[PDB]
Design a protein around this ligand. Structure first.
Ligand SMILES: [Cl-]
Length: 227
């Protein structure tokens, strides 16, 4: 169908990422499903081979805002689903405080009945003994809300937010995200009034999986607009 109708049930998800951080090349494949009625995503990511060169938590935001639960009074503000099936391009620059940065470009769109998130990531200037390349981040994830704003001239949305990654020493590693989303096709899209998307995420492991991997459970709920 078109738009939100594509998300009324459980939708299989495929995620693919090709990455390069400080020359260290790697790829990751993920699969799972999203149930936007509950704003719920369940995914498992497996590195193609060997060990992932960066901490899994640092890739959570890069690895599906179309699965957010927009309340019944906010359906006209859901840009993400409105772009489906053709989809949108999501671009980000993520600056890790006192360390390197990731630049990502992803195409989120349906291929058949599967929602696919295909990503290219390039990371540069990371410190060999920093929290990222040094794998000093805790395997967990904090909750928070981000501020969504329309970008009328780009016919999309913009988002700037920070992720606080807990460090084993008790401190926190900040990752400043600058995000832009643009539709792929020339069809209509819903440009929203400013609002919030609130996330709750839990990282875990598959008990029997021997490969380097991450299981992610995420709930995303839109808020901020008056009834
Ligand atoms: Cl929430």
């Amino acid at each position: 169908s078109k738009g939100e109708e594509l998300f009324t049930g459980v939708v299989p998800i495929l995620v693919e990422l090709d990455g390069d951080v400080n020359g260290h090349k790697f790829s990751v494949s993920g699969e799972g499903e999203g149930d936007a009625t509950y704003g719920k995503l369940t995914l498992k990511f497996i590195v193609t081979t060997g060990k992932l060169p960066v901490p899994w938590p640092t890739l959570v935001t890069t690895f599906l805002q179309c699965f957010a639960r927009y309340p019944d009074h906010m359906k006209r503000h859901d840009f993400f689903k409105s772009a489906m099936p053709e989809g949108y391009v999501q671009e980000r620059t993520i600056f890790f405080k006192d360390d390197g940065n990731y630049k990502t470009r992803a195409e989120v769109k349906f291929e058949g009945d599967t929602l696919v998130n295909r990503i290219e990531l390039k990371g540069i200037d990371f410190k060999e003994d920093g929290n990222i390349l040094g794998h000093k981040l805790e395997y967990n994830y904090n909750s928070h809300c981000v501020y969504i704003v329309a970008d009328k001239q780009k016919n999309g949305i913009k988002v700037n937010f920070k992720i606080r990654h807990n460090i084993e020493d008790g401190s926190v590693q900040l990752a400043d995200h600058y995000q832009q989303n643009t539709p792929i096709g020339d069809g209509p899209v819903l440009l929203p009034d400013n609002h919030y998307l609130c996330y709750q995420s839990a990282l875990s492991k598959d008990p029997n999986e021997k490969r380097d991997h991450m299981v992610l459970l995420e709930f995303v709920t839109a808020a901020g607009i008056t009834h």
